[PDB]
Amino acid sequence: PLNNYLHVFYYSWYGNPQFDGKYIHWNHPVLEHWGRHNPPDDIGSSFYPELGSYSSRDPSVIETHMRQMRSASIGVLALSWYPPDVNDENGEPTDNLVPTILDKAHKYNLKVTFHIEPYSNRDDQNMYKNVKYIIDKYGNHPAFYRYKTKTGNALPMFYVYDSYITKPEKWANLLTTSGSRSIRNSPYDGLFIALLVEEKHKYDILQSGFDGIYTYFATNGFTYGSSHQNWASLKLFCDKYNLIFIPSVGPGYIDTSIRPWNTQNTRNRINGKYYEIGLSAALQTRPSLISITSFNEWHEGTQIEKAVPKRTSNTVYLDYRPHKPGLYLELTRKWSEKYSKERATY
């Protein structure tokens, strides 16, 4: 059975010459601070996908991804989303793949929710527009995710990455009752999940009107929110203030193909043990949802997607030996079933 309460962060930003006319994302630039890879032999990842330097628009890729997520008993993909009108994307807008993704998710009884990226000049005004757009265009699709609240009401969910860039007073225009562009008590109401990075964000989130928090980062120690030391405190905080706590767990982290300096935030997978430690840490908070970073953020080495050994003449790749390419899907299934069993007792 699928765990309806387990979400994974999904990316549809990959392109290749066969499907897109060029590489997209695999030819990721090497960043200089907070010179591009040459696919297919040299991609912007420390690992190599079983599907190769694949295209996110290739229907066989999307099919395989939905099968893998069902095999992991993940019920919901949280789709990285940019509005089409921004100049944030190097191809054709990724919003034009959302219908295919919803249809493919539905084949396997998966749901799709939205991870709103930090698009150019995102604010309260264009967030109202984009929330309305997502619910109007996608909200009637049978694979469209809603979360049933304490009061019985089922609402769309929006994860807001780097929410803190926008000041609380501006969020309150959208997220509080009497705000100038309120979605509250409207057909466009939702559960808005803030990214909690720093401990001081707790108060900002309360002033903003958010409905919950998530932590995203797969590195235990990168941020206050991402640190297992703080998850009991964040759960206490969320329970006290009627917020949905969504801890984010990853299987490892390595982004040095794109951020060569960032060795401090590398986390060895310990042949699956890092992931199992983080899953244990999340489950014992008795959270309402758990998120997994990531299905396929290959740049940052957080993926649970199948990876394979690969040798080339110029690039070195990590892999999942001495285990199989599907290790992380198998570990996810084990912990998904434990979470389903324990959550039914809360």
From Swiss-Prot:
Gene field: MANEA
Protein name, as recorded: Glycoprotein endo-alpha-1,2-mannosidase
Tissue-level expression: Highly expressed in the liver and kidney. Expressed at lower levels in muscle, pancreas, heart, placenta, lung and brain.
PTM note: Undergoes proteolytic cleavage in the C-terminal region.
UniProt catalytic activity: N-{alpha-Glc-(1->3)-alpha-Man-(1->2)-alpha-Man-(1->2)-alpha-Man-(1->3)-[alpha-Man-(1->2)-alpha-Man-(1->3)-[alpha-Man-(1->2)-alpha-Man-(1->6)]-alpha-Man-(1->6)]-beta-Man-(1->4)-beta-GlcNAc-(1->4)-beta-GlcNAc}-L-asparaginyl-[protein] + H2O = alpha-D-glucosyl-(1->3)-D-mannopyranose + N(4)-{alpha-D-Man-(1->2)-alpha-D-Man-(1->3)-[alpha-D-Man-(1->2)-alpha-D-Man-(1->3)-[alpha-D-Man-(1->2)-alpha-D-Man-(1->6)]-alpha-D-Man-(1->6)]-beta-D-Man-(1->4)-beta-D-GlaNAc-(1->4)-beta-D-GlcNAc}-L-asparaginyl-[protein] (N-glucan mannose isomer 8A1,2,3B1,2)
GO CC annotation, single: Golgi apparatus
Keyword RNA-binding listed: no
Localization terms from the record: Golgi apparatus membrane
Alphabetical keyword list: Golgi apparatus, Hydrolase, Membrane, Signal-anchor, Transmembrane, Transmembrane helix
Molecular function GO terms recorded: alpha-mannosidase activity; glycoprotein endo-alpha-1,2-mannosidase activity
Residue intervals on the Lumenal side: 1-346
Family, similarity comment: Belongs to the glycosyl hydrolase 99 family.
Temperature dependence: Optimum temperature is 37 degrees Celsius.
Signal peptide extent: none
Range within the parent protein: 98 to 453 of 462
Region annotated Catalytic, chain positions: 1-346
pH-activity profile: Optimum pH is 6.2.
Leading EC class: hydrolase
The keyword Cytoplasm is assigned to this record: no
Enzyme Commission designation: 3.2.1.130
Membrane topology listed for this record: Single-pass type II membrane protein
